[PDB]
mmCIF file of C-alpha atoms (C1' of nucleotides) in Angstrom:
data_model
loop_
_atom_site.group_PDB
_atom_site.id
_atom_site.type_symbol
_atom_site.label_atom_id
_atom_site.label_comp_id
_atom_site.label_asym_id
_atom_site.label_seq_id
_atom_site.Cartn_x
_atom_site.Cartn_y
_atom_site.Cartn_z
ATOM 1 C CA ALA A 1 -40.188 -20.544 22.340
ATOM 2 C CA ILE A 2 -37.694 -21.622 21.159
ATOM 3 C CA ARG A 3 -39.134 -24.794 19.002
ATOM 4 C CA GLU A 4 -40.917 -22.031 16.858
ATOM 5 C CA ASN A 5 -38.029 -19.342 15.790
ATOM 6 C CA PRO A 6 -34.720 -20.346 15.779
ATOM 7 C CA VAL A 7 -32.823 -18.648 13.834
ATOM 8 C CA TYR A 8 -30.453 -16.429 15.516
ATOM 9 C CA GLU A 9 -30.190 -12.254 14.181
ATOM 10 C CA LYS A 10 -26.981 -10.722 14.780
ATOM 11 C CA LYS A 11 -26.147 -8.052 16.188
ATOM 12 C CA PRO A 12 -25.133 -5.747 14.238
ATOM 13 C CA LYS A 13 -21.471 -4.728 12.584
ATOM 14 C CA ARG A 14 -20.924 -0.625 14.743
ATOM 15 C CA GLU A 15 -18.615 2.125 13.343
ATOM 16 C CA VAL A 16 -15.273 2.226 14.850
ATOM 17 C CA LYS A 17 -13.886 5.660 16.147
ATOM 18 C CA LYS A 18 -10.665 3.904 16.122
ATOM 19 C CA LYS A 19 -9.324 4.481 18.938
ATOM 20 C CA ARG A 20 -6.248 2.174 20.525
ATOM 21 C CA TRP A 21 -6.053 0.677 23.901
ATOM 22 C CA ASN A 22 -2.828 -0.976 24.220
ATOM 23 C CA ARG A 23 0.259 0.206 24.121
ATOM 24 C CA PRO A 24 1.909 0.146 21.307
ATOM 25 C CA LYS A 25 6.397 -1.662 21.008
ATOM 26 C CA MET A 26 8.598 0.387 21.704
ATOM 27 C CA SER A 27 11.247 0.333 18.770
ATOM 28 C CA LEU A 28 15.107 0.053 19.189
ATOM 29 C CA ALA A 29 15.837 3.592 18.216
ATOM 30 C CA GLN A 30 13.851 4.834 21.010
ATOM 31 C CA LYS A 31 15.434 1.835 23.516
ATOM 32 C CA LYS A 32 18.691 1.790 22.016
ATOM 33 C CA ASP A 33 17.943 6.081 23.124
ATOM 34 C CA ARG A 34 16.993 4.862 26.309
ATOM 35 C CA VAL A 35 19.816 2.325 27.462
ATOM 36 C CA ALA A 36 22.243 5.719 26.567
ATOM 37 C CA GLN A 37 19.893 8.305 28.490
ATOM 38 C CA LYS A 38 20.900 5.611 31.011
ATOM 39 C CA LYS A 39 23.900 4.960 31.427
ATOM 40 C CA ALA A 40 24.951 8.910 30.889
ATOM 41 C CA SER A 41 22.505 9.499 34.223
ATOM 42 C CA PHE A 42 24.573 7.192 36.081
ATOM 43 C CA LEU A 43 27.739 9.307 35.476
ATOM 44 C CA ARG A 44 26.517 12.625 35.732
ATOM 45 C CA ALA A 45 25.930 11.036 39.018
ATOM 46 C CA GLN A 46 28.314 9.601 39.704
ATOM 47 C CA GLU A 47 29.972 12.527 38.969
ATOM 48 C CA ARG A 48 28.314 14.237 41.560
ATOM 49 C "C1'" U B 1 54.753 -20.212 -89.657
ATOM 50 C "C1'" G B 2 46.647 -25.111 -94.607
ATOM 51 C "C1'" G B 3 48.741 -25.294 -88.617
ATOM 52 C "C1'" G B 4 48.793 -22.734 -83.576
ATOM 53 C "C1'" G B 5 48.195 -18.798 -79.647
ATOM 54 C "C1'" G B 6 45.426 -14.714 -78.120
ATOM 55 C "C1'" G B 7 41.584 -9.410 -78.225
ATOM 56 C "C1'" G B 8 36.833 -9.712 -78.330
ATOM 57 C "C1'" C B 9 30.844 -8.950 -79.813
ATOM 58 C "C1'" C B 10 25.119 -6.437 -76.605
ATOM 59 C "C1'" G B 11 21.971 -4.761 -72.521
ATOM 60 C "C1'" G B 12 20.825 -5.194 -66.331
ATOM 61 C "C1'" G B 13 22.431 -4.574 -61.251
ATOM 62 C "C1'" C B 14 25.242 -4.842 -57.020
ATOM 63 C "C1'" C B 15 30.131 -2.878 -54.543
ATOM 64 C "C1'" A B 16 33.767 1.092 -55.255
ATOM 65 C "C1'" C B 17 33.941 7.616 -56.111
ATOM 66 C "C1'" C B 18 31.689 12.644 -54.500
ATOM 67 C "C1'" C B 19 26.910 13.742 -51.789
ATOM 68 C "C1'" C B 20 22.270 13.866 -49.475
ATOM 69 C "C1'" U B 21 18.329 10.456 -46.401
ATOM 70 C "C1'" C B 22 15.687 5.989 -43.901
ATOM 71 C "C1'" C B 23 14.454 2.122 -40.217
ATOM 72 C "C1'" C B 24 16.749 -1.325 -36.453
ATOM 73 C "C1'" A B 25 21.089 -3.252 -33.316
ATOM 74 C "C1'" C B 26 24.941 -2.454 -30.145
ATOM 75 C "C1'" G B 27 28.406 0.909 -26.956
ATOM 76 C "C1'" G B 28 29.020 6.047 -24.643
ATOM 77 C "C1'" C B 29 27.124 10.847 -23.841
ATOM 78 C "C1'" G B 30 23.411 14.466 -22.520
ATOM 79 C "C1'" C B 31 18.237 15.272 -21.834
ATOM 80 C "C1'" G B 32 13.482 14.551 -19.491
ATOM 81 C "C1'" A B 33 9.552 11.912 -17.070
ATOM 82 C "C1'" C B 34 7.710 7.108 -13.504
ATOM 83 C "C1'" C B 35 9.679 4.241 -9.462
ATOM 84 C "C1'" G B 36 13.619 2.824 -4.336
ATOM 85 C "C1'" C B 37 17.292 4.560 0.359
ATOM 86 C "C1'" U B 38 18.512 8.715 2.857
ATOM 87 C "C1'" G B 39 18.169 15.218 5.806
ATOM 88 C "C1'" G B 40 15.116 19.889 7.511
ATOM 89 C "C1'" G B 41 9.985 22.486 8.074
ATOM 90 C "C1'" G B 42 4.764 21.972 10.256
ATOM 91 C "C1'" C B 43 0.493 19.855 12.407
ATOM 92 C "C1'" G B 44 -1.158 14.731 15.976
ATOM 93 C "C1'" G B 45 0.194 11.530 19.489
ATOM 94 C "C1'" A B 46 3.001 8.209 22.140
ATOM 95 C "C1'" C B 47 7.310 6.975 24.292
ATOM 96 C "C1'" U B 48 12.202 7.507 27.797
ATOM 97 C "C1'" G B 49 15.611 10.189 31.073
ATOM 98 C "C1'" U B 50 18.250 10.184 39.509
ATOM 99 C "C1'" C B 51 19.276 18.014 35.345
ATOM 100 C "C1'" C B 52 14.992 20.297 31.205
ATOM 101 C "C1'" A B 53 16.525 17.248 27.849
ATOM 102 C "C1'" G B 54 15.739 13.496 23.785
ATOM 103 C "C1'" U B 55 13.505 8.774 20.620
ATOM 104 C "C1'" G B 56 10.641 6.238 17.744
ATOM 105 C "C1'" C B 57 5.720 6.577 14.962
ATOM 106 C "C1'" G B 58 0.528 8.477 10.916
ATOM 107 C "C1'" C B 59 -0.657 13.410 7.304
ATOM 108 C "C1'" C B 60 1.202 16.401 4.741
ATOM 109 C "C1'" C B 61 5.026 20.149 3.144
ATOM 110 C "C1'" C B 62 9.266 19.672 0.587
ATOM 111 C "C1'" G B 63 14.961 22.418 -1.825
ATOM 112 C "C1'" G B 64 17.041 18.072 -3.244
ATOM 113 C "C1'" G B 65 20.662 13.912 -2.146
ATOM 114 C "C1'" C B 66 21.895 8.746 -4.706
ATOM 115 C "C1'" G B 67 21.559 4.382 -7.187
ATOM 116 C "C1'" G B 68 19.662 0.740 -10.757
ATOM 117 C "C1'" G B 69 14.747 -0.897 -13.904
ATOM 118 C "C1'" U B 70 10.917 1.220 -17.763
ATOM 119 C "C1'" C B 71 9.732 5.254 -22.165
ATOM 120 C "C1'" G B 72 10.381 9.721 -24.737
ATOM 121 C "C1'" C B 73 14.950 13.122 -27.271
ATOM 122 C "C1'" G B 74 19.251 14.844 -29.001
ATOM 123 C "C1'" C B 75 24.502 14.077 -29.393
ATOM 124 C "C1'" C B 76 28.641 10.832 -31.039
ATOM 125 C "C1'" G B 77 31.136 5.145 -32.965
ATOM 126 C "C1'" U B 78 30.015 0.732 -36.273
ATOM 127 C "C1'" C B 79 35.658 -1.512 -43.180
ATOM 128 C "C1'" G B 80 27.250 -3.147 -38.636
#
RNA sequence: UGGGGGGGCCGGGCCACCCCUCCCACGGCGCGACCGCUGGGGCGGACUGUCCAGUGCGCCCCGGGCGGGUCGCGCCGUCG
């Protein structure tokens, strides 16, 4: 069978629904607000 | 006092006067359109924080602000 028909048949391209499965890279503003929030929470916990 | 010294002879254009009016260049002022950046709302969602709060992202809405580049227009100035 191989020697009588070697040509390849590509699988048809599927339409894409565009779902993201990973996690996007966090931004500078987000991480700076995160560190500010952590600092404030630590100060509040020290206050109590 | 024949010699010597002068005025000249007829048309055209231009700049000077006084006014109108083009196109172009340069500067200023103002108006308008096309572009960049920035504060609010809505929708969807992703995330963060040892109180329920907060932060980006994609779409739309934006009233807009700022600024310079292109084009159009009006006005002012040039022994242009």
